[PDB]
Write a protein that binds this DNA or RNA. Structure first.
Ligand code: FES
Ligand SMILES: [Mg+2]
Ligand SMILES: [Mg+2]
Lengths: 131, 105, 92, 46
RNA sequence: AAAAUAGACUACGAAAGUGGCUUUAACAUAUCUGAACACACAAUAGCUAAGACCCAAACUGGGAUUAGAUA
């Protein structure tokens, strides 16, 4: 599910006094009047809060997996409309491959975080075919 | 986001120009826009003859409507401009002020 | 010994010249400025060898001119006669 | 600073209340976006 | 339908390729090598079905020309 359109942008969510503000400025500063990239940023921020131990550390493998997952969701939403977009088809298939690679590395290094990631993002890890 | 509507309206008398401006701004607000400013660039001869709604125009009034609209609004507004008969030409662009100056030093 | 040479960038280098439009905003509605970069008789756009602009501002001017032409702000086959007496910034 | 600037700016927006008055005021005003540049890189106001 | 100027530019794209304007999506990946057999693309021949046909056009007819015509 997407964030509500009334949610404030990530950059305008900790500014002091944002609750003492007129409705019109709230609309101007919401996801209703921004392109899709802020909504994806909000999704990423929510997942980082929900899954990882340190939401601020973005270089960790779990953070990269979450980022690639939101990107993959974006590609699937895009291809649901542009069925003949071969470039974005390539991008989606590749991104799935590297997310599988990151999941393999996380499994081999940190199993607890791997379980948490797989539960939080609804990812079913599958072992590669032998032939 | 923030958009600018450049509007080329038919060379008409003031009451009808006011009516058309009210109608287009009302459409913008109906599609979810917050209109910021309305600026009149003036009435002037067109750079070239423009055929619209089965009528040939050589003069027109130029207006700018700054606004903030939800992204899905733009396409709809375009269709509406395609139906209004008093508009020779309406074009919606991302507002130039949002594009921030590149640091060419 | 203090008299040995020291390592530094060449100080005798003239800082790269800034094009006349550097630091200025190029808008498709500013038909006066955009008419300072077209042929008076044909309306063709001048190149950077004539205008002298850095390639980035050349691209901005090109895109602005096309935007103005298609949005009904600027003539295409000629320069608008009202702007024939503006300062000549082109080397032609 | 951006938020405060919007606090001050949102006051003077065209609402559905002051629509007609602002439309007439726009019809009673002209704005100019044309300026010229010299070989010296100086803006020549119209 | 396909895009004179810019373009004396050499950018984007994995490659083939992309140079009219606006808007919306949007441009994978923090080591490298590793596919005939996995998934995506791409191009090159040659035939098969139907369809359009302005224009051009191998073949096929017609007209004019030396003294085996102009191939
Ligand atoms: S150096 Fe300033 S515009 Fe290029
Ligand atoms: Mg490899
Ligand atoms: Mg034929």
């Amino acid at each position: 599910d997407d964030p509500p359109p009334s949610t404030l942008l990530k950059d305008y969510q900790n500014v002091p006094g944002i609750e003492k503000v007129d409705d019109v400025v709230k609309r101007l500063l919401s996801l209703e009047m921004a392109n899709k990239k802020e909504m994806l940023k909000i999704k990423q921020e929510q997942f980082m809060k929900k899954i990882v131990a340190n939401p601020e550390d973005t270089r960790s493998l779990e953070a990269r997996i979450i980022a690639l997952s939101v990107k993959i969701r974006s590609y699937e939403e895009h291809l649901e409309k542009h069925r003949k977009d071969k470039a974005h088809k390539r991008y989606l298939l590749m991104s799935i491959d590297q997310r599988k690679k990151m999941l393999k590395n996380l499994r081999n290094t940190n199993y607890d975080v791997f379980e948490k990631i797989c539960w939080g993002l609804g990812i079913e890890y599958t072992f590669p075919p032998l032939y | 986001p923030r958009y600018e509507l450049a509007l080329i309206l038919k060379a008409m008398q003031r009451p009808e120009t006011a009516a058309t401006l009210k109608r287009t701004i009302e459409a913008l607000m109906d599609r979810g826009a917050i209109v910021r400013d309305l600026e009149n660039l003036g009435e002037r001869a067109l750079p070239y003859r423009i055929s619209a709604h089965s009528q040939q125009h050589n003069r027109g009034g130029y207006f700018l409507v700054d606004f903030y609209a939800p992204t899905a609004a733009v396409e709809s507004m375009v269709e509406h401009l395609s139906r209004d008969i008093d508009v020779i030409r309406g074009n919606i662009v991302k507002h130039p002020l949002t594009q921030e100056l590149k640091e060419c030093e | 010994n203090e008299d040995l040479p020291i390592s530094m960038e060449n100080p005798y280098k003239e800082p790269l010249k800034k094009c006349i439009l550097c630091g200025k905003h190029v808008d498709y509605k500013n038909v006066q400025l955009l008419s300072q970069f077209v042929s008076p008789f044909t309306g063709c756009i001048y190149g950077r060898h004539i205008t002298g602009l850095c390639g980035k501002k050349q691209k901005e001017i090109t895109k602005a001119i096309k935007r103005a032409q298609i949005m009904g702000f600027m003539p295409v086959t000629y320069k608008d006669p009202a702007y024939l007496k503006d300062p000549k910034v082109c080397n032609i | 600073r951006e938020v405060l600037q919007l606090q001050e700016e949102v006051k003077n927006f065209i609402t559905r209340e002051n629509l007609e008055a602002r439309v007439e005021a726009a019809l009673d005003s002209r704005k100019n976006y044309n300026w010229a540049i010299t070989r010296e890189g100086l803006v020549v106001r119209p």
